[PDB]
Ligand binder design. Structure first.
Ligand SMILES: NS(=O)(=O)c1ccc(C(=O)N2CCC(c3ccccc3)CC2)cc1
Ligand SMILES: [Zn+2]
Length: 256
């Protein structure tokens, strides 16, 4: 199946998932000078005070911190969105080196990693039905640069030992996602897709202008994870990012 290796990586995905060459694929390069300020964009509304994390999972491509999305406990609204989107999970994409790792790029600049807080439009009933809709998902992207440590991320870093290989999971309750946010909520927004197969074009991307900083130690831990399952040859989980795709007939809007 698909992955990020030289033989099953992004350049191969189109064979099993032809939408890979679609009209609204993600990620994309964010040309800051070409993005247009849209004064009609409402302020983003992040309501995570009632968030309920349940567990963390190594799925073989990245690791997901899942939340209870059976109720409106942690929602995203406002901004370019119409309606209420529930947070279902967040994960990251990172590189083998600090100079790479993010999926989106800013004026071609690559960050060491990128956080994706995934939400689905409640009007669609569940995540599965939502990914089948043009406005089914809202993914909040947050760039990570290496510098000072991000205190709110350490709980995540310290649990990675428990889910080193594909398929492992561990309880991860009472984790507060608000600790992963930058001070500013200024953002860029554009219509796109999931950045991994099936690459469905069901995402409204909201990428924050301000990156958060994490320490070299924190990111190093990410790089000790495995793509493989226990008892299989060790393949470090690194560079699990898709490169920038053609913007085509789309325009990136800025909230600032
Ligand atoms: N990187 S990202 O764009 O943020 C992103 C976000 C979420 C997922 C994700 O969970 N998968 C697995 C489940 C699959 C699916 C679920 C239900 C019905 C059909 C398909 C969609 C993709 C992948 C990439
Ligand atoms: Zn992602």
């Amino acid at each position: 199946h698909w992955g990020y290796g030289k033989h099953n990586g992004p350049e191969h995905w189109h064979k099993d998932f032809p939408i890979a060459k679609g009209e609204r694929q993600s990620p994309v390069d964010i040309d800051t000078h070409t993005a247009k300020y849209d004064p009609s964009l409402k302020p983003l509304s992040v309501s995570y005070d009632q968030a309920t994390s349940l567990r963390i999972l190594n799925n073989g491509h990245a690791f997901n911190v899942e939340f209870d999305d059976s109720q409106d406990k942690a929602v995203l609204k406002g901004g370019p969105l119409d309606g209420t989107y529930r947070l279902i999970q967040f994960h990251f994409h990172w590189g083998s080196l600090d100079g790479q790792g993010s999926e989106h790029t800013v004026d071609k600049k690559k960050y060491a990693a990128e956080l994706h807080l995934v939400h689905w439009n409640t009007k669609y009933g569940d995540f599965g039905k939502a990914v089948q809709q043009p406005d089914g998902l809202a993914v909040l992207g947050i760039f990570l640069k290496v510098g000072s440590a991000k205190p709110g991320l350490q709980k995540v870093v310290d649990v990675l030992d428990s889910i080193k290989t594909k398929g492992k999971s561990a309880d991860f309750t009472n984790f507060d996602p608000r600790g992963l946010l930058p001070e500013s909520l200024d953002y860029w927004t554009y219509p796109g897709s999931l950045t991994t197969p099936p690459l469905l074009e069901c995402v409204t991307w909201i990428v924050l202008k301000e990156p958060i900083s994490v320490s070299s130690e924190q990111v190093l831990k990410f790089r000790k994870l495995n793509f493989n399952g226990e008892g299989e040859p060790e393949e470090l989980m690194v560079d699990n990012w898709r490169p920038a795709q053609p913007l085509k007939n789309r325009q990136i809007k800025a909230s600032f």
